[model samples]
Target: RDNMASLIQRIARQASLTFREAPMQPGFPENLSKLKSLLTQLRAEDLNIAPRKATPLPPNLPPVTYMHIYETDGFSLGVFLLKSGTSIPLHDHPGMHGMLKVLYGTVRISCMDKLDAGGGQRPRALPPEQQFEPPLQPREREAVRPGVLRSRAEYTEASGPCILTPHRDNLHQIDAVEGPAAFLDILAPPYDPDDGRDCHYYRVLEPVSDLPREVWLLETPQADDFWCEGEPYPGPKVFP
Candidate 1:
């Protein structure tokens, strides 16, 4: 049997080889898919990724926190721990590829896409198929932008990874369902502001009237309610 760190090293190498250049090689996506399959096979014990109990936390801490596992020029692997009922607000990963595999408990994920291609404040044209209504006022419009609902789904430890690409399902909000939860997450081309992969937060707007879950998003300042503190990864070490 392979060690968790060894498997991660394999995935990281393949990921870097597969995405190190734009216009990825035709065979790379297949290779990447194979790598991701190995990731979904990982168990909490395999990575020493565990969830914390809901014993009252210190008042000063955010409800959510992360344990960074590994990183390289290619990708990053980490575990996110969410306290019961806590929500990570809708946010964008810019141009990145991500996968989330729940290690324990459940979560509700609402996914969206950025409809504005110009990447700045601009009048948005809502699609006829979409059900969103009410345009933001001059002041409010400054903060909001258009997006399309991709899907809303429930994930449990038994479920396969939830995947995101540079465009599809690129933005999402995750809520810890019922009780505390944790998941192993992988992000390719990890957030590097200099490379323009900065993380940004959003607020879902009105007219989210159905389970299909279509709505607009306001580019608000990082919500005071949503933040992440880091903890040490107790998993096996991966070396270059």
Candidate 2:
């Protein structure tokens, strides 16, 4: 039967086969495209998830919760539930590819891509409204990274999945819009510190010029105010 468990099993197997070799290998694109196609068909009902009610979130509760679906050496699959008005801070998926499909409610995602070492000139002064409270120092300036603000798009249950590659739209910030939201998230080869694939948080810096899309980013420690608590997955058990 074509059930949630089978669907997830197929997805995971496809992920393993697709990422089994380097991205530059033959047939990689076709396999990755097929994986994205499969992801686009997933929905909240498939995982026994429902839209959360618009209740006031308790202060002691985490702003976000993760429901573990499955994981293998090739990939990790899960669902992230965001409380109303909360956000997953801007972060990078170093050396990884990801797909995010909204399961319920809505989320606005700001996707960005890092630029080359010599991609742009010096950044301009921030307008009064965008300046940091403590102001940036020389040391912080040295930590700035050049990048491009690719897109800031909103996705509802009806929208297709957002895709991120190792080199494009790899850094993103997801925000729950209007109400609580949840999305199916899949990351390839998972984040392994031993493999130098650790997650890094970032803050957007002022643009290098009046030119649109050109931007800079400053690496930052994870925000103390934001953290994700785990909840058991309610969906069908997936086997790799």
Candidate 3:
């Protein structure tokens, strides 16, 4: 546990230096990658973390809960607990860099990178091969924004950390694969509604034709079904 706190302190320092401001420096990626490696080595016990409450579950509440660990002007660290058969809706972390290291169980994350709006044709038209449960229509298809799918991987305790940047996989959704799960997440320049870094919800207007995992995203109201409850961090007192 002592080693864990030291590792987290290192991550906070690197993040503070890297995201002291926007338009990250030339060497930010390397520094961030180093932090990722450090995070990958962590486990649930390292932070004295655990899964969702087993006593009883609450009804009419979002299936996810949060445990805030530490924060500074440059970054914030926390854990997100997802209940079985639940998910965190697709959302965007504007101008932020983040990493997710699973602590226990399984989580399948679907990641997509936003594409330049006026760069060119988005190719966001859905093909016959594309299938949805209720199905998509022209209205929904016309509203999709351009993006490239980054990855759709199930992360477990042993899985390497998943990373995201301002432009890549910064918009994503996480689902608990089978049972309850949790992941330690680090976000540089934490969410601030005042700074235009507020969280935004999104939906796929069109599942890109022929592209394996690409799609167009449309900003939407906060998903009523996806909100987070809070839990006390039951771990070492971390100072950074």
Candidate 4:
């Protein structure tokens, strides 16, 4: 228990995680084992945390919802339940790191890398820190490119959490398979309103008429296309 707690604490500190910031150390797998051990040691009597609440997304959604299971001044832990054929959009974590073990179902993650400005088509796994939200639209916004959809993967309950960062796979979109699914998540440093670190949504630019489904990075200094209308936190009282 002690080691797991320390590992999570250290993860939060090193990741500088905010709801939007995505910066996880490559050593996350080792840290995750510590989390599983801690979960095993937790007894109902030693609840330094609260039970999770079930939250429902707006009826307008395709039927996906999320809830906060636990949070401290340093971190946020929660779950997201998605409906059949539903998914979270490809988005960026300004600068964040943590783990996202799947609780149930399947989620496909597409990772990507930003190309050197005007550089040729050389693909690499995007680094975490290199990801950035445009301020006023970088030069690439209106151009046709394929930087939007980087790499993709699928995760299920047996799989560990899906990882992200400012550099690596920081920009992503998720989709649920034939049935509903869910995943547990952790974010360090938490999103801070004072720092302009709010989550921003995006759309990939289109290159050719035939590449309608492809995504390209556009430099637009605009507000995020995604809006978070707040829902109730379903988890138990975290302040105990």
Candidate 5:
């Protein structure tokens, strides 16, 4: 794990470079390419090399986690470690782009697009360069912009990385499968709570489909069960 931990630091460095070198625009493929190459470094070490959760969060929480898995001047990476059965309930990352890479074990990720209470499914395909749309409501235009479900999938060490944007699977629930698991996650520009980019929580509306994790999520207030009772981050200390 020491070698992988070192790799984590390296990726963090690249993340910093990615933010500085790549333009924060739709056609900025260079940033994505650099990120893809560095994240692929997670494969250079054993899948189990990632560190544990940083604090004594909720009991069901994993024994370890990383807040600033890595960071650059423009971006930051984070991670959630999970002992089998632990899960991060449904939530959304507004106006941000992120990548989740599992370092070990398997993760059952149930992701969804926005939906209307009327039961009509939102279409998945949107303009490629178009990330997200602002709220349609006249008064709440900047506050809430609902979306249609785009697509969903599960990932493991073998499945490569699962991608998301402030506009993409911006709403999702990540589950640690039946065994201990950990993942390396990168978020560009990071989450700025003071700037309204805060992580807003939610609850699955209802299972839209008869399938397992497939369901609709209704906009709701912050969740009480999802509270984070902070604890010391056991992994090596990190800074941006």
Candidate 6:
């Protein structure tokens, strides 16, 4: 009998098995690396996805759309299609591991990581114009996190997956380049506010003097201009 499983199903199974335990456990890194290897081989055709056209989109359509593939308590898999000239704002994935592999077109991702208290070089004072209108109180200042912009790079369908860990490259902003783009996304231990894993948007403050990559980030509510419309996945089902 030849009832072979789909590639996405294998990925889902691997992700569930790998992330079911804490990352500190032995064999986690190897398992994670194996998962990444599987992910890199995925392509749009594997999921029955077609590259979106670069032409002007209808006004009624959302700037971005998502197609859910499968999900478990251990991980969630989906595809995000970004319209030309639109972007996903800078956001933090609190205590999560993520992998993004472009399915079509290209995306420029700016990845950043939060700095521990006194972990990195001190930032220079903000210019008068960049300073808060009214000085932030001690409590309000807690909303701002100091971090370093690790890398700002573009990825395409031919590139390897962009990776993120809880402590590194955990915050990022994604921009569709030149034209429309889409990528397969996997997040371990999917966002659940009840479990203290909630998404938070951020704004990059002026760059710290002397240290070009050092920057301040202010947490903010989700922008009204950005929202994702959901569509049912049309690919092979990963879960029975």
Over 4 Å off in model 4, which ranges? 1-33, 36-62, 115-149, 209-215, 219-239
Clash count for each candidate, listed in order shown: 0, 0, 2, 37, 10, 0
RMSD per candidate (Å) reads 4.9, 4.3, 4.9, 9.4, 8.9, 4.2
lDDT of 4 by residue, 1-240 (tens): 544344334433333323322685445555546555443333222323232233434556545566655666666776566666666765567666545766566778666545444445464443333434432243433342345455567876656456665555666667777577766567665677688876544556432223213345643343333332334554334433
What's the lDDT of the predicted structure labeled candidate 2? Answer: 0.82
List clashing residue pairs in candidate 3: 145-216, 145-217
Worst 10 residues of 1 by lDDT: 123-132
Comparing 2 and 3 on lDDT, the stronger one: 2
What's the TM for model 5?
Answer: 0.65
TM-score of 6: 0.85
What lDDT score belongs to each candidate, Candidate 1 first? 0.77, 0.82, 0.76, 0.53, 0.59, 0.84
Give lDDT tens digits, candidate 2, residues 1-240: 544356666777777777765566548899889888888888788788877967766779999999998787878889999999999999999878898889998898998877754445454543434455356777786677667787888899889878898877899999999989999999987989897878899998653233247776889999998999999888878763
5 against 6, candidate with superior TM-score:
6
Best by lDDT: 6
> What order do you get sorting by lDDT, best first?
6, 2, 1, 3, 5, 4
Better of 3 and 5 by lDDT: 3
lDDT of 5 by residue, 104-157 (tens): 777778666564444564534322343323322333322333454444455766
lDDT of model 1 at position 198: 84
The segments of candidate 3 whose C-alpha lies over 4 angstroms from its true place after superposition are: 1-5, 21-27, 51-57, 117-143, 206-211
Report how far residue 162 has shifted in candidate 4, in Å.
Answer: 1.7
What lDDT score goes with residue 155 in model 3?
Answer: 80
Q: Each prediction's TM-score against the native? A: 0.82, 0.85, 0.79, 0.57, 0.65, 0.85
